[PDB]
Amino acid sequence: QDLPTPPSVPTVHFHYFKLAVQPQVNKEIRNNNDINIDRTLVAKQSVVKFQLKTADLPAGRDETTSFVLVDPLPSGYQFNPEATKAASPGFDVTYDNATNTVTFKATAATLATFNADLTKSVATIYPTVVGQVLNDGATYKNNFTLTVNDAYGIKSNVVRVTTPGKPNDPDNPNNNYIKPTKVNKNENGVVIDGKTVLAGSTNYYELTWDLDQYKNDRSSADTIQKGFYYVDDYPEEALELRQDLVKITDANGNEVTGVSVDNYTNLEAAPQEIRDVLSKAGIRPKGAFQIFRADNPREFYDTYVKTGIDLKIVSPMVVKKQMGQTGGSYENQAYQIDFGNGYASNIVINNVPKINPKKDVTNYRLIGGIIPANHSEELFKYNFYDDYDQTGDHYTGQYKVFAKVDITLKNGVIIKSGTELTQYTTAEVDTTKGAITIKFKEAFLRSVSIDSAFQAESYIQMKRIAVGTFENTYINTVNGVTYSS
Amino acid sequence: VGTQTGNPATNLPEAQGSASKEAEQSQNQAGETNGSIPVEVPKTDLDQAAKDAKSAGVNVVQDADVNKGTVKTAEEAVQKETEIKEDYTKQAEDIKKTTDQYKSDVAAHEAEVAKIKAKNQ
Numbered sequence: 095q096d097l098p099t100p101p102s103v104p105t106v107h108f109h110y111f112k113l114a115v116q117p118q119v120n121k122e123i124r125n126n127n128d129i130n131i132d133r134t135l136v137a138k139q140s141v142v143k144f145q146l147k148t149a150d151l152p153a154g155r156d157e158t159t160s161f162v163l164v165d166p167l168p169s170g171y172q173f174n175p176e177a178t179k180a181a182s183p184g185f186d187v188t189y190d191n192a193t194n195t196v197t198f199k200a201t202a203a204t205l206a207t208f209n210a211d212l213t214k215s216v217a218t219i220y221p222t223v224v225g226q227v228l229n230d231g232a233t234y235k236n237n238f239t240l241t242v243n244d245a246y247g248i249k250s251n252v253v254r255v256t257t258p259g260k261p262n263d264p265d266n267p268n269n270n271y272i273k274p275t276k277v278n279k280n281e282n283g284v285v286i287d288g289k290t291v292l293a294g295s296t297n298y299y300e301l302t303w304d305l306d307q308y309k310n311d312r313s314s315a316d317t318i319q320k321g322f323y324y325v326d327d328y329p330e331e332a333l334e335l336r337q338d339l340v341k342i343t344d345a346n347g348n349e350v351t352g353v354s355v356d357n358y359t360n361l362e363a364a365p366q367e368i369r370d371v372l373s374k375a376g377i378r379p380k381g382a383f384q385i386f387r388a389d390n391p392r393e394f395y396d397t398y399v400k401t402g403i404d405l406k407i408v409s410p411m412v413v414k415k416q417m418g419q420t421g422g423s424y425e426n427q428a429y430q431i432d433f434g435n436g437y438a439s440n441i442v443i444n445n446v447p448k449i450n451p452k453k454d455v456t457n458y459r460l461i462g463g464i465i466p467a468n469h470s471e472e473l474f475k476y477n478f479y480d481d482y483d484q485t486g487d488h489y490t491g492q493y494k495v496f497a498k499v500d501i502t503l504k505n506g507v508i509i510k511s512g513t514e515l516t517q518y519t520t521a522e523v524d525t526t527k528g529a530i531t532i533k534f535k536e537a538f539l540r541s542v543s544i545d546s547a548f549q550a551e552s553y554i555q556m557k558r559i560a561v562g563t564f565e566n567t568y569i570n571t572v573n574g575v576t577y578s579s
Numbered sequence: 580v581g582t583q584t585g586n587p588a589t590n591l592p593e594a595q596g597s598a599s600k601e602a603e604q605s606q607n608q609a610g611e612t613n614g615s616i617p618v619e620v621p622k623t624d625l626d627q628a629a630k631d632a633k634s635a636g637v638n639v640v641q642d643a644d645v646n647k648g649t650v651k652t653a654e655e656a657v658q659k660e661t662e663i664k665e666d667y668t669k670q671a672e673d674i675k676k677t678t679d680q681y682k683s684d685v686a687a688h689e690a691e692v693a694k695i696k697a698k699n700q
């Protein structure tokens with residue numbers, strides 16, 4: 095008998111698997127209160143924080159031998175090494191000034207944490223770049239590179255934030271330029287920039303606090319606490335304040351509260367807080383100035399700033415009588431100071447005419463002062479006052495008054511130079527005192543165009559009733575101011 | 580004043596400068612990756628089963644490593660690692676089944692051979 099055949103030798107197969115992991119990263123951008131500000135808006139000088147985060151390292155990994163984060167930072171973002179180090183325990187921090195790049199390397203300690211249990215996934219830790227944004231109208235973008243064991247590398251998402259002062263901002267549709275405005279207006283609201291302004295007239299300066307670009311701002315509380323001020327550096331050599339007439343309204347036409355007003359003879363007279371604010375804003379007023387202050391920065395911010403609601407300040411200022419004696423120009427300029435950041439308004443210039451009445455003999459001829467063309471305010475008073483000896487000279491009761499320039503009325507009527515104007519005047523005579531006042535009727539003076547020059551002269555008929563010398567004094571009053579001689 | 584940005588700033592008036600070449604390149608490459616972190620699942624049970632198979636006279640062939648590829652999260656990796664462990668466990672059981680069946684067939688064969696030999700004796 096033959097033997098059975100042995101069982102066939104069988105074959106088996108086996109194989110191993112390969113597997114690998116690419117942990118994700120995420121760069122976050124936050125304000126100084128750790129509020130997410132990606133694609134929003136924060137004030138110039140805001141602390142901006144960059145958190146360079148990494149997803150969990152996987153179970154079954156090899157030991158991690160290096161864990162490195164490299165962050166090329168944005169231009170205008172000022173790196174803070176000490177705050178960054180303080181915010182980034184577990185990392186060694188280094189910085190390249192040439193390329194504005196910060197590098198974080200996990201310390202041996204941090205790696206030991208990552209390496210403690212290779213059989214389970216482990217959460218990473220993250221560094222935080224701390225710095226400040228230094229420019230108006232700027233967009234600060236940022237991402238970073240993670241490299242693990244010099245064998246795995248990945249670049250993060252790009253985060254950003256923008257500062258106010260940039261038009262066509264796709265993240266912030268209300269963003270535009272920060273441009274405080276100053277305009278000079280008369281009592282009827284006509285713009286009088288560049289015009290002649292008579293001594294005793296009021297400049298109803300109008301100041302715009304330009305807040306619209308700040309709408310939906312996401313600045314931190316420390317930044318907001320730097321407050322909100324408005325400065326009018328007024329020409330104190332020419333003007334006196336009528337601070338009692340100040341009015342502050344918002345862009346919806348509502349009265350503003352919580353804004354106080356003060357004025358100071360100079361910086362040195364001002365409190366320390368104001369000197370500090372002005373210093374930090376780079377503003378040095380010349381001599382005297384007026385300052386408007388948000389009493390409660392938080393409330394002001396919530397009410398007008400984050401809402402983008404402009405304010406309008408009316409600050410009336412009167413031309414001193416002395417300016418009518420000297421003549422001269424004066425300039426006004428304002429500043430808004432938001433979150434400690436100053437911005438200068440345009441400058442507004444006006445000039446004051448030197449009014450020069452003259453006395454002549456032909457009849458005393460009292461030549462009135464000239465109101466130049468292109469002046470800013472209605473004429474309401476134009477008087478001739480003559481104090482005569484009466485010893486002396488005897489008033490007959492006859493006087494006449496004439497136009498000395500072509501006078502244009504509000505309806506385009508012209509009174510030609512030389513035209514008698516006596517009918518538009520009255521006269522008060524004190525023969526015992528030896529004084530006479532010739533007054534133009536107010537309604538007539540107010541009918542004169544503010545574009546028009548104005549001038550008149552009086553002839554006062556005198557019979558001499560004595561011998562010797564009789565000093566004669568003639569004073570011309572124009573609106574609120576007297577002018578001698 | 581105001582010539583740098585259009586905002587008449589009286590402090591910190593400078594415009595933001597050009598981005599560094601480093602930031603531009605890094606941002607243009609957002610999301611890009613190089614390499615990966617390899618992860619391992621222990622093979623010792625599978626190796627022991629193949630060794631035992633060889634020792635029993637079974638023919639053993641190792642096939643090429645199967646590349647499961649790359650995953651983006653630790654949680655996916657843990658899932659795939661579990662699949663691998665389960666695959667190793669099944670591979671090992673199959674090998675072990677074959678080896679036991681071989682050992683039994685061989686035992687049975689020799690027993691028969693002993694009967695036949697005793698007859699021919």
Ligand SMILES: [Ca+2]
Nearest residue numbers: 271272304307
């Ligand atoms: Ca604006």
Ligand SMILES: [Ca+2]
Nearest residue numbers: 328380381382
């Ligand atoms: Ca001043």
Ligand SMILES: [Mg+2]
Nearest residue numbers: 435436588590
């Ligand atoms: Mg500024």
Ligand SMILES: [Mg+2]
Nearest residue numbers: 426442443444
């Ligand atoms: Mg002015």
